[PDB]
Amino acid sequence: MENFTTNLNQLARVGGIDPLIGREKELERAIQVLCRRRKNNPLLVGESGVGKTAIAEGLAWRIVQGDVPEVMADCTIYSLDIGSLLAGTKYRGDFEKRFKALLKQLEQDTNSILFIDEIHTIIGAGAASGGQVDAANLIKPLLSSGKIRVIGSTTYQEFSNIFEKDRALARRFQKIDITEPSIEETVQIINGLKPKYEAHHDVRYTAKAVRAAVELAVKYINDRHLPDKAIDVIDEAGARARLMPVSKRKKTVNVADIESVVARIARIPEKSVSQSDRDTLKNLGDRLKMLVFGQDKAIEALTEAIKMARAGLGHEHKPVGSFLFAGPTGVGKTEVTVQLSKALGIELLRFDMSEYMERHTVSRLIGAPPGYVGFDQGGLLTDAVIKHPHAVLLLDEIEKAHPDVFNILLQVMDNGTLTDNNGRKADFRNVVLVMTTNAGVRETERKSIGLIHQDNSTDAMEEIKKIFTPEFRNRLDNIIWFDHLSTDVIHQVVDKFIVELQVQLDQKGVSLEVSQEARNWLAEKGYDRAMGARPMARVIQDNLKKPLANELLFGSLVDGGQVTVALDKEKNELTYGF
Amino acid sequence: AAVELAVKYINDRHLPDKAIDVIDEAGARARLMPVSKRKKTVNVADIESVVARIARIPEKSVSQSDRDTLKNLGDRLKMLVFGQDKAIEALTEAIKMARAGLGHEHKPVGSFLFAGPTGVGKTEVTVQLSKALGIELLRFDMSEYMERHTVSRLIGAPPGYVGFDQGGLLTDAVIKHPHAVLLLDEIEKAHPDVFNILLQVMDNGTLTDNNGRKADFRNVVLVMTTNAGVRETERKSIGLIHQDNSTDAMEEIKKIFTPEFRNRLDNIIWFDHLSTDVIHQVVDKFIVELQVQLDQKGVSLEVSQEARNWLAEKGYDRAMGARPMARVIQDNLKKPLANELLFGSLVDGGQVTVALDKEKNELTYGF
Amino acid sequence: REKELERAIQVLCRRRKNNPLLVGESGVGKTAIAEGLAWRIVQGDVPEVMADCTIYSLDIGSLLAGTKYRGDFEKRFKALLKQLEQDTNSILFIDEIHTIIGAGAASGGQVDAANLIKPLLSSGKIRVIGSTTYQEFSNIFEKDRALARRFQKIDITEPSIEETVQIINGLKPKYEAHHDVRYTAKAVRAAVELAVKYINDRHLPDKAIDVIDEAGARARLMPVSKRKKTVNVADIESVVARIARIPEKSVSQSDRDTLKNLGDRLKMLVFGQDKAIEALTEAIKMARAGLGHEHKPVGSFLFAGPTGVGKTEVTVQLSKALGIELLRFDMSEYMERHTVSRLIGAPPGYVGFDQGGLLTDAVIKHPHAVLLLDEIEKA
Ligand SMILES: Nc1ncnc2c1ncn2[C@@H]1O[C@H](COP(=O)(O)OP(=O)(O)OP(=O)(O)O)[C@@H](O)[C@H]1O
Ligand SMILES: Nc1ncnc2c1ncn2[C@@H]1O[C@H](COP(=O)(O)OP(=O)(O)OP(=O)(O)O)[C@@H](O)[C@H]1O
Ligand SMILES: Nc1ncnc2c1ncn2[C@@H]1O[C@H](COP(=O)(O)OP(=O)(O)OP(=O)(O)O)[C@@H](O)[C@H]1O
Ligand SMILES: Nc1ncnc2c1ncn2[C@@H]1O[C@H](COP(=O)(O)OP(=O)(O)OP(=O)(O)O)[C@@H](O)[C@H]1O
Ligand SMILES: Nc1ncnc2c1ncn2[C@@H]1O[C@H](COP(=O)(O)OP(=O)(O)O)[C@@H](O)[C@H]1O
């Protein structure tokens, strides 16, 4: 007792314990257990960081304050330091000697309570070249006789996995569940605790700041539990605003600072648009339309979803956007998404649904069940989302995956959460789910038989409905049906590819100019409505790169200069030179 | 009473210690009661309260505030889920029979299978029921359980395997919250082999995880939501007259769920589609939620009545239930609102009025 | 890393659980970030709150060395804890935070360095900086809820191109002193860009610097005839090629000749069907001339025609003439849908998982090769 436990009453007398607020029924039942005749040993079990240790030390704090029923008055709770207890037990019997001496001291006191934090650790305290003769059994007979009182604290998992193993020790304690408090209890706890943090960080918290901290930590941080994550938000806000007086920012911590802390912790695009975040969102449709020609309404839908997200009008809990892009090949379905990722400056999560042809490939997405060979790997999808919570999720050619795999995205779109094999949950509320497919293509490109050609516009939707279950479609933000590229779009695509080729050549230090009629001839040569834009890339490659490759590989353009490409009219041929 | 209740509701210790602990805690409680000198005998009510607090289960509460909570539960839910009253009625009656003590022997509070077209309040009624009771909500998306060997994920890996020390998720959750609402979403999309776990649970209210530990489901409401049988109900027959395909819905459900599984259910509540007035109420609900979102930004909003009617007429889709209304309201309101909140008039200001003209059926905006 | 360093400093000055956790992919610079915080403290490039603070890197080996005689490890650990508590101005840096969840005494196996430290961290008594990769974190560290709760998660993200360029600029003098070689700015930028484009198995601030160091080391092995030189873009290209398997600038050698006479060297082996040799040579030339695709295979060709016309022979001869391996797959063996699992592997939890995929592994082992799909109509 001299130097192995710390007097918690002494701490509360010197203010070393943060004050216990609320927890009325919990502490009342802890006292009730303490007042039993036999096995008066309460065990505080609960989630990690919900106030179990807080309750245990707040009992002694209340004793010092005297706001306790007049049966635990003058009782002194001591926190056991197992670490220092085991320090010098090098020789046989030292541990048992010191432990039993402390035990008989506690027996003689008849007023003290021994609080053992993380009591699940005492299932072994030294069997070094020996048997079960450690503290796990030394403490057993004293509890059953009701001579001493011990308070335990452990999480549900550690309890179930370690403490429940020894039924003899397990039955000597009274399990008490410390549940996570609700909103009002948490904000009141913060109200009672924040004087100390204001003192430590030399700041002031507004009431709205505290309420916002509570609500945001609730709806944005799903890693931890309320009474600790809220005060963590508070502490980090205090520290940040305390580091600001380098420019003499002696002021209160308003709501905006709380949102800064929450966004920097949860890695979310918060803190209201502002600065230029507004400029970037403003001309995003432009920066995309200059790289994706035609199919502008897809860019419109994407930008509207992103703005609604940043404007605070997003969904309560859903991905930023859940889009199904369907249309013929080579019309920019994946390109608009990749360019959106590059424009926003965030991560692109590309997944090739063609690799998920079989039903049993779901385990590749979410991980293998426990006990199996691939358990230690987790799942690819959820791991990627957890690593990059703010990103764009691209699922290429979802019609190629097994029709059953869609049921994962079902829950992902509906709730924005996905649980891997470890019970961990990925947060999809900050991702844009975009799925590309060629579903309605073959049905729209059909030939009517009869004297009257029919309207086949609805056939793309018919095919998509036949492929995707009604509940899967019912969770999509919108289905943007892409149309084929028109000839002016083809000219613009040819120009974009010319710019790409020019960049490639500038890398080699040579310049290229292509006459306008040459561009027109290339467009008229390569245009194929049924195949979109890839034939343009192919024809441009064949017509320009191959002659250019020969010219620069074999001397004529080695460290060359200007490439002179123009079109003649008699043969529709191109010119070349240095 | 101490003996009987410690037997029936404590299953972690052995009888000669269970009863002694019940009696000792009752004595300590009656000894702490006389802070106002109420040194009394231990009545049956005190023993019942002690065991209910030990078993973490609800006691007799026909007088407390939760009696009123149960009194107005059906209405406090009907204000959030419009139509489909029979589901709310069944849920409330099951919760009452459990709380009234006139419950099932050792079964869960209620075992209900919710089936019907998508986009209706099958899962939403469950979320709002968990909120209205203030009890934990355990959500399990059975779509993550397509393979038959994912049962190991539910109940844990057998001893002598890599995933043993983690334990099952379902049993661990129920251990953490013995009084909760258990939501199993899209169970027909899980592997049909998984249904046998639910067989065992529904019949006995108990479940043994990998550690031989038994989870107690007697105080957990079991609600499972499916979209099974919907294809037939909405499938058009060929002929001059269409048939009620509800018989086909029943046939499909029986195809998917073995006879004993259907026998271990409290009821199968067939959710209906949403009517037009129900659509109007849904529009009102979503507009209220949008108004809350805007007030978070400091923007008041007023939407006219005929604008509401026009939104409902534009978004009404019988096949998809209430979900299309979300998109309709989204595009028709949030888009101009997002523009005005980002690079427009509604930056730190509100008073946005939306009204419908009759020449173009368009919306008004602005300060 | 001023943003991340500022986040770390903000975390350290907190009242409770003021223990930042540097989480990031390997090679990103987590250990580098901690030791550079120490370095800037030495140079005073810190806010006054962290000034005059001493960071200690905790060694686990020497801490557990010889800790027989139950209590030796505990006594030693508590002695370290007491020295740090008395210092009141020290931060303990644990390079591998996921490795302190076990400290022997498997009998019982509970009183380890993890449970020994939780009271200190929860009380805000001591400041410790951790570091771990993402998978180690999520599979080893975060499993201990109470320990993960006492640490503040900081994501150390992969830097950008220009950030990498500046990092290499700042690190260059040490590599110069080590190799006695000098780097040109164009060479550094080329190293960064080529490492991004062609090296796929590492992350920027550890693979661009890898190219820099290896170029310096090889140019240090050039003065066997005393070829004293600075590192130009050419050496960088050679280095990045030794991993990408195709040099871009070495084409100024006889590689130009091999390209030029390739069509003929094939025509002497494949008679007729000149169109195929022409197409293949044009594709390979466009690739080697830098005009090829930046994210596509060198060439994707479908050869169709009657039997015995040289469809398979021309590809084998092309592989021979180029000196590259022939990754040969017969699509008649993949006549069934489920056979794709041979090419890509089985999902986790299934019998063939640990084997991997045939095609992907063959490609990874041979980054530069010709892929032949015999009888594709049979798959
Ligand atoms: N009633 C309370 N009053 C004030 N703070 C509380 C209360 N309950 C919890 N806390 C906060 O939680 C922290 C203490 O956590 P607690 O001891 O409850 O969990 P724990 O013992 O750390 O759990 P584990 O052993 O799983 O880590 C304190 O920093 C405090 O801010
Ligand atoms: N609107 C467009 N503007 C510019 N380039 C385009 C456009 N549409 C297609 N492309 C070209 O096509 C390539 C990408 O095509 P994309 O991935 O969009 O096809 P897709 O719609 O996915 O068809 P599939 O799924 O069948 O491949 C780009 O390299 C780009 O040059
Ligand atoms: N009765 C209702 N009242 C109000 N809103 C409803 C109702 N039914 C559904 N909704 C809307 O639908 C959303 C919830 O959908 P839910 O999860 O119930 O779909 P579901 O029944 O699972 O369909 P599926 O299983 O086919 O996906 C809520 O956001 C809510 O706005
Ligand atoms: N901020 C930085 N400035 C310069 N170089 C850095 C920086 N961060 C990392 N590096 C480079 O990375 C190397 C050190 O690796 P670092 O400590 O960053 O990660 P690590 O210790 O390898 O991580 P782990 O411990 O997980 O393996 C150094 O050689 C250095 O060149
Ligand atoms: N055009 C050709 N020139 C020279 N040899 C050829 C030609 N076509 C076929 N052969 C010979 O016939 C054999 C079969 O050629 P291959 O291309 O593999 O046939 P397939 O097209 O059926 O795969 C080869 O070994 C090759 O030597």
Give the pairing of strands C20-23 and B206-208: unpaired
Is C49 in contact with C127 (CB distance < 8 Å)? no
- Chains interfacing with B (3 or more CB pairs < 8 Å): A
DSSP state string for A300-314: HHHHHHHHHHHTT-S
Structure tokens that stand for A110 in this block: 């008849």
CA distance C13 to A243: 8
Is A322 in contact with A475 (CB distance < 8 Å)? yes
In the stretch 220-249 of chain A, residues with CB closer than 8 A to chain C read 223-224, 228, 231-232, 235-236, 238-240, 242-243, 246
CA distance C369 to C97: 42
The residues, any chain, with a CB within 8 Å of residue C307's CB and separated by 6 or more, are none
| DSSP percent split of chain A into helix, strand, coil, nearest 5 | 50, 15, 35
DSSP state string for C304-362: --STTSSHHHHHHHHHHHHT-EEEEEETTTT-SGGGHHHHH-PPTTSTTGGG--HHHHH
CA distance C132 to C134: 7
Q: How many cross-chain Cβ pairs, A to C, lie less than 8 Å apart?
A: 199
Is B100 in contact with B84 (CB distance < 8 Å)? no
Burial class (CB in 10 A: 0-12, 13-18, 19+), C49: middle
CA distance A425 to A416: 10
Q: What angle do CA A304, A309, A311 make, to 5 degrees?
A: 90
Q: At B301, phi and psi to the nearest 5? A: -140, 140
CA distance A32 to A488: 83
Determine whether the interchain pair B338/A171 forms a contact, defined as Cβ–Cβ distance below 8 Å.
no
From the CA of C270, how far away is ligand 5's center (Å)?
A: 8
Torsion of CA B127, B131, B136, B138, to 10 degrees: 0
- Indicate the SS3 state at residue A481: strand
Closest CA to A497 of C291, B45, B6, B126: C291
Q: At C370, phi and psi to the nearest 5? A: -110, 130
Chain B positions touching A27 (Cβ under 8 A) are none
| Min distance B11 CA to chain A CA atoms (Å) | 12
The beta strands (E) that lie in chain C are given as: 20-23, 54-57, 90-94, 127-132, 152-155, 325-330, 369-374
CA distance B67 to B198: 31
CA distance B225 to B172: 22
Determine whether the interchain pair B144/A418 forms a contact, defined as Cβ–Cβ distance below 8 Å.
yes
In which region does residue C309 sit, left (phi positive, over 0), alpha (psi from -120 to 50) or beta (all else)?
alpha
Amino acid, single-letter form, for residue B291: Q
Is C129 in contact with C92 (CB distance < 8 Å)? yes
Burial class (CB in 10 A: 0-12, 13-18, 19+), C202: middle
**Resolution of the model in angstroms:** 3.4
CA distance B95 to B70: 8
Is C27 in contact with C205 (CB distance < 8 Å)? yes
Please tell me the number of Cα atoms within 13 Å of A188 on its side-chain side.
9
Which helix (H) or strand (E) segment holds residue A325: the answer is strand A321-326
Torsion of CA B94, B96, B99, B105, to 10 degrees: -40
The residues, any chain, with a CB within 8 Å of residue A78's CB and separated by 6 or more, are A1, A5, A6, A7, A8, A112, A113, A114, A115
In the stretch 4-23 of chain B, residues with CB closer than 8 A to chain A read 12-13, 17, 20-21
Closest CA to A53 of C17, C16, C122: C122
* Residue in A closest to B159 by C-alpha: A371
Q: How far is CA C206 from CA B145, C165, C202, in A?
A: 40, 12, 7
Give the pairing of strands B352-354 and B301-303: parallel
Closest CA to C370 of C332, C324, C331, C330: C324
Structure tokens that stand for A369 in this block: 């069940």
Structure tokens that stand for C248 in this block: 């871009």
In which region does residue C329 sit, left (phi positive, over 0), alpha (psi from -120 to 50) or beta (all else)?
beta
In the stretch 61-90 of chain B, residues with CB closer than 8 A to chain A read none
Residue with CA closest to ligand 1 atom 18: A51
For every residue of B4-18, which 3-state class applies, written as one string? Answer: HHHHHHCCCCCHHHH
**A157, A231, A235: residue with CB nearest C145:** A157
Is B153 in contact with B169 (CB distance < 8 Å)? yes
Closest CA to C262 of C252, C248, C276: C276
From the CA of C31, how far away is ligand 4's center (Å)?
A: 5
Test mutation, A41, A461, A471, chain B, max B CBs within 10 A: A471
Q: At C143, phi and psi to the nearest 5? A: -65, -35
Q: Is the CB of C275 under 6 A from ligand 5?
A: no
CA distance B274 to B281: 10
CA distance B208 to B197: 10
| Min distance B134 CA to chain A CA atoms (Å) | 9
Structure tokens that stand for B26 in this block: 């009752």
